[PDB]
C-alpha cells in the first residue's frame with residue numbers, strides 16, 4: 001500500500017494509482033499537463049487569507065493569481081486549470097484541510113483530485129484528453145497508492161499520516 005516517500009521529480013504515473021502528496025510549505029504542490037487541452041496545477045494556501053494577488057511559477061512561467069482562504073484554521077488546496085496553451089487559469093474544487101495532504105489520480109479519461117473539507121472529503125475530476133500520458137511534476141515528497149486501496153488514501157487525506 002504505502003509506497004514511498006519519493007522525492008520531487010517529473011514522471012509519468014501509472015493510471016489507477018493515487019499520488020499522495022505531502023507538502024510542508026505553501027505554494028505549488030503538483031502540476032501536470034497533456035500539452036494540448038489540460039494544464040493543471042495545485043496550489044496550497046495558508047489558513048486565513050483575505051483576497052490578494054500572488055505570483056506563482058507554473059510550468060516554468062510566472063503567473064499572477066488572485067487567491068483567498070476564508071478558513072481561520074484550515075489550509076486550502078486549490079486546483080488551477082487552463083484548457084489551451086495561452087488560456088487563463090480558473091480555480092476549481094477546493095479542499096480545506098487540516099492534515100496538509102492531497103492526492104491526484106489518472107483514471108478513465110480524467111484526472112481525479114480530492115475535495116471538500118477534512119475529515120469528510122469527497123473526490124472531483126477533470127476530463128483530460130490522452131489522460132494516460134499526462135506527466136506530473138511533484139514539488140514535494142509523495143507516496144503511491146493503488147486505486148484498489150482508495151479507502152486507505154481517503155483515511156490519510158481525512159486524518160493524516
Ligand SMILES: CO[C@]1(C(=O)O)C[C@H](O)[C@@H](NC(C)=O)[C@H]([C@H](O)[C@H](O)CO)O1
Nearest residue numbers: 081082083092093110124125126127128
Ligand atoms: C466538462 O465537465 C467537467 C469535466 O471536465 O468532465 C465536469 C467536472 O465535474 C468538472 N470538475 C470540476 C471540479 O468542476 C470539470 C471542470 O469544470 C473543467 O474540466 C475545468 O476546465 O468539467
